[PDB]
A and B are shown apart, each in its own frame.
Chain A
Amino acid sequence: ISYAAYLNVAAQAIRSTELQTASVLNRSQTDAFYTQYKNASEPTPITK
């Protein structure tokens, strides 16, 4: 876990009383699949 990942997890936790706007909610959870590659060859996508 990277330093900014460390901060990230904290920020996400920090978004907990409710009052939480959409931009907060998007900033808290996002969907993406990092597609790792080798040389062409592709270790198949897995959620970021």
Chain B
Amino acid sequence: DPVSSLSFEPSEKPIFNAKTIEQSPSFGKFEIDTDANVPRDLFEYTLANQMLTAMA
């Protein structure tokens, strides 16, 4: 994480599993669709979206 333009701190974050997505406390203040496999898609989607950011 580039803390300041004169500093740099190595930083870590946890990428959230498909298991995580499933049981996430609020998941009822979002409209999941059973027919859609939104966890198996969203897991993948945030795998990359987060990872790209980490790389950036």
The reply to whether A and B meet directly (CB within 8 Å) is yes
Which residues of chain A have a CB within 8 Å of any CB of chain B? 2-4, 7
B residues with CB within 8 A of A: 40-41, 44-45, 47-49
- 13 A-B pairs with CB atoms under 8 Å apart are A2-B44, A2-B47, A2-B48, A3-B40, A3-B41, A3-B44, A3-B45, A4-B44, A4-B45, A4-B47, A4-B48, A4-B49, A7-B45
Residues on the A chain within 8 Å of B44, using CB: 2-4
> What CA separation (Å) do A38 and B40 show in the bound complex?
27
Chain A nearest Cβ from B10, distance in angstroms: 22
The answer for the CA separation of A7 and B47 in the assembled complex, in Å, is: 13
The 7 A-B pairs with the shortest beta carbon distances in the complex, nearest first, are: A3-B44, A4-B48, A3-B41, A2-B44, A4-B44, A4-B45, A3-B45
